[PDB]
Design goal:
By secondary structure, this protein is an alpha+beta fold. About 30% of the residues lie in helices and about 15% in strands. GO terms for molecular function: ATP binding; enzyme binding; HLH domain binding; RING-like zinc finger domain binding; RNA binding; small protein activating enzyme binding; SUMO conjugating enzyme activity; SUMO transferase activity.
């Protein structure tokens, strides 16, 4: 249950604050009046340079349960992104985010985030969370490229 949870979150940010990859953003949403919600972070992930995702800065929400770090966080892109492993709801499907798959309590927010950044340009056809994105990616990569480039532009800093 919580408490154990908060302990870890409390530690996570301290770590990140000390060192995080350049470009990424990860911070706990402010609960009103000075308080704070460590179980809800707003983060952002830079497109990887050298790929069509380059230049865009993507915002995704990270929600935690009291189980934490028993169970992994739910990570939602806000708004949802056009990508084969992102459900239409914006939820990301990554194996380390599955309790029964590769989730481990020692995983770092930073590892999660980096992990997510690497999924953007290297989609995993095995788990088709988003059908449309999946269809096009298989029978029309030129189109797939067109849509991604547009998306990266749509969210680039200005």
């Amino acid at each position: 249950m919580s408490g154990i949870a908060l302990s870890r979150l409390a530690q996570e940010r301290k770590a990140w604050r000390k060192d995080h990859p350049f470009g990424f953003v990860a911070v706990p949403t402010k609960n009103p009046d000075g308080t704070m919600n460590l179980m809800n972070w707003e983060c952002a992930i830079p497109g990887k340079k050298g790929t069509p995702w380059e230049g865009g800065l993507f915002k995704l929400r990270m929600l935690f349960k009291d189980d934490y770090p028993s169970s992994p966080p739910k990570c939602k892109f806000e708004p949802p992104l056009f990508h084969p492993n992102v459900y239409p709801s914006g939820t990301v499907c990554l194996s380390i985010l599955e309790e029964d798959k590769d989730w481990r309590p020692a995983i770092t927010i930073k590892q999660i985030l980096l992990g997510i950044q690497e999924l953007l340009n290297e989609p995993n056809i095995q788990d088709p969370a988003q059908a449309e994105a999946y269809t096009i990616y298989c029978q029309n990569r030129v189109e797939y490229e067109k849509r991604v480039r547009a998306q990266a532009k749509k969210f680039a800093p200005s």
